[PDB]
Design a protein around this ligand. Sequence first.
Ligand code: HEM
Ligand code: HEM
Ligand SMILES: CC[C@H]1[C@H]2[C@H](C[C@H]1C)[C@H]1C[C@H]3/C=C/C(O)=C4/C(=O)N[C@@H](CCCNC(=O)/C=C\C[C@@H]3[C@H]1[C@@H]1O[C@@H]12)C4=O
Ligand SMILES: CC[C@H]1[C@H]2[C@H](C[C@H]1C)[C@H]1C[C@H]3/C=C/C(O)=C4/C(=O)N[C@@H](CCCNC(=O)/C=C\C[C@@H]3[C@H]1[C@@H]1O[C@@H]12)C4=O
Lengths: 390, 390
Amino acid sequence: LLTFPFASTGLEFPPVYHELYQQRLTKVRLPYGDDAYLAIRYADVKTVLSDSRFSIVASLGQDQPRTRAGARVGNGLFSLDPPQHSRLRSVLGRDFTPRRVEKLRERVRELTDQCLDRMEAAGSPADLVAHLAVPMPTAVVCEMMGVPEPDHHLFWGWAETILSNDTTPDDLIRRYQEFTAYMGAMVEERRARPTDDMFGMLVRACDEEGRITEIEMHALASDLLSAGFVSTAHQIANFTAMLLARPERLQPLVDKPEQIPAAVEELMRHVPILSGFSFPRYATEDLEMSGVTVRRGEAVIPVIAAANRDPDVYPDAGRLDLERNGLPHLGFGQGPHFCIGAHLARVELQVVLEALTERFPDLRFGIPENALKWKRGHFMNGLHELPVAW
Amino acid sequence: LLTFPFASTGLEFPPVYHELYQQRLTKVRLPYGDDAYLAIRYADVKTVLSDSRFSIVASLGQDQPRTRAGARVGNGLFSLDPPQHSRLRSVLGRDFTPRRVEKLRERVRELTDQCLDRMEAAGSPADLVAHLAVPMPTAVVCEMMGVPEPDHHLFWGWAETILSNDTTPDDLIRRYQEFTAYMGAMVEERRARPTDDMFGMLVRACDEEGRITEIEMHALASDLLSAGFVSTAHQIANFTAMLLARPERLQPLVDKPEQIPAAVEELMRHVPILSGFSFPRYATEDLEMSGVTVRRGEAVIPVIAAANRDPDVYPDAGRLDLERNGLPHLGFGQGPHFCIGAHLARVELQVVLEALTERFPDLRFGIPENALKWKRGHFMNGLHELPVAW
Ligand code: HEM
Ligand code: HEM
Ligand SMILES: CC[C@H]1[C@H]2[C@H](C[C@H]1C)[C@H]1C[C@H]3/C=C/C(O)=C4/C(=O)N[C@@H](CCCNC(=O)/C=C\C[C@@H]3[C@H]1[C@@H]1O[C@@H]12)C4=O
Ligand SMILES: CC[C@H]1[C@H]2[C@H](C[C@H]1C)[C@H]1C[C@H]3/C=C/C(O)=C4/C(=O)N[C@@H](CCCNC(=O)/C=C\C[C@@H]3[C@H]1[C@@H]1O[C@@H]12)C4=O
């Protein structure tokens, strides 16, 4: 069988996908776990993500297809199907609706401004990863949750552990133990002095209203503080690097600031954020997909980066066209597990581009593009550093 | 209770939504059937359409909230929840993927050109509704299914019965009898001799593969010949009118054809196609929506038109901006029942704007704007006629 993931470096999209688009659904071998099919057509990835005949739960003795040594297991949102998944997420739902997140726009800009004050002070050329991509989205969720600045580094360490392909089940226990200890102390603080932040809301959801158990309270906290900043950090960097590699760099968005939202969406579509893949889903019954009968219990991987370059949905898919305004990309997923933070990410990315265009309109690479240190072996594509000059 | 639908005329967005968006989920009373909540925020209409806790089936004795006198009931796709819905739909799925539908672009343009030849031959001013909006999408699906041209008028009549608010269960009996008779004949004919058309595919699905039963084959065919062209017909005229009512008319799209797909999407967002509403959904368990506890069994109506002008999703929502390339609209719906024809409709609307810009760049209203005969009190908004000049 073909082995997956395929060879690529940086944000490269590998040419093998252009072969597979026109073939039937193909089975691949993965680094750990059972084999799986590769959903790469737009409609197929949509199906895998959103159709009730695909379960995110391995209930028929499957060995989870994956790139990480330890199978991804827990009691939080990625471990549940609807309706259980739906009631649990609805504990967070109302804090991530556009109507709520839109109110954060100002604070996001403020934090972004502080970061850039600090970058400007450091002087050209500076590492935009260290000065902006890491700090800003981390502050955003940590102050949303109620985690003090000085502990941010702990949550980076736990999130890298989740995301590292070389993490073992032991490594995950160690994480679980450390994280539980941390939040447990935070729970006790909030019980004695209640706070208005999200963790406070979670503690009340548990203690007062009896809406969730302690296990669910911790699980949701773990999900947000794990999923909630490392992805945006990687994208802040990926997005700027994509833009600076263009002859005109930021100038189109300097000239036409009203096109920044569209630009954010095109980049969401075009950047292959993952060198791995997310959760496989499993057929709850036999079903047909791209010329193949997928049997009950068999795993299908949703390759969202291939979806976002489907030749039939997106003409000239490999071209970054910031005016494309393409059909709706799958970069935040689809169906039940559609990114609960999708609007917050869009706000964070719109705000980063606003602030860079307004403050550093002549922003450019601070080293030769050829010297950029892309992450090589990692679950997520991105940059170790992004030196920029102004 | 607040009565719904709200007063509006033509494609006017009624101002009352600007009130309701700020407020908690509100309950309305309908022309027929039980009362229901009005889902109007983006995220809420999404939930209603996509969340498994919302069923399209009244399984607890409910009287379907509606504007039509006779309740909407049958054996096709709008009468099913997943997975039963999913299994029936999958019989058609393959034929409506973008990969399949993109192959129809040539033929859709051919038919659009024939329509425009007749219009031009009729002479300025001419009615674009009669010459293009009605014939072209009717011909597209009927020839897809294998229905001959001379019989198109019959399918228009059956479709309007379904869509007319003044239709009784008796009128629906007549329709069903007439329609079943007609497709029965088509079935005999396809059984006596194979044809490579969509109805012929349904016949193979019933007779040869035993995938579906005879009344499901009929249902599916009825769904497609009912939903499959009156909507596109109404939008072709709605879209053209929207464009012709602006100072610049068609010139922005003449000048930049590459923006035609984006305009189609903005129009889909902006145009309130329904005066009424689609199917209500029923909560299958207690849940929270916009500050209200929706109890099990209670109905919630997804108001697509309102979601598409959600003030927090869409800044300045009332403005038709063809470059907006906004966050994805709910105009083709969402979840299980997301329009099976969405790509075909995008193809049809794109091709119509391509053909109109290329052939009639100085297209303009053929009568004074205030004379336009907008449909009054009908289920869908639109024009009885659209005189155009060139
Ligand atoms: C550019 C940044 C981001 C990207 C590209 C992204 C992408 C995604 C994708 C594709 C999924 C679904 C994976 C699957 O279905 O297998 C997901 C889920 C999730 N994301 Fe995001 N995300 C981003 C930012 C955020 C933010 C800012 C937050 C929270 C503050 C967040 C929290 C979550 C959570 C909790 C889930 C699981 C939701 C569920 O299973 O119900 N993400 N994200
Ligand atoms: C501008 C044109 C169109 C618009 C605005 C439109 C809109 C919609 C919407 C919003 C729904 C879902 C309603 C709900 O969930 O309550 C739907 C369903 C449906 N549409 Fe379309 N549609 C269009 C064109 C078409 C075309 C061209 C076809 C051709 C086959 C078609 C066939 C269907 C069918 C069969 C369903 C039911 C699907 C299901 O329940 O699984 N429609 N449409
Ligand atoms: C750029 C977007 C990427 C996403 C990525 C998929 C990509 C599209 C998911 C993959 C999740 C793995 C999760 C995971 O391995 C586990 C696990 O081992 N146990 C549980 C409970 C442990 C605590 N919760 C979590 O850590 C929950 C989410 C963290 C990540 C999350 C990242 O945001 C980035 C679980 O969810
Ligand atoms: C602008 C788009 C509009 C859509 C509209 C909702 C809007 C968003 C739906 C509403 C459906 C009503 C359906 C309906 O009344 C019935 C009924 O009475 N019996 C069944 C079986 C009868 C045979 N199937 C059908 O007629 C199936 C679809 C036709 C319409 C369909 C039109 O595309 C237009 C049924 O579905």
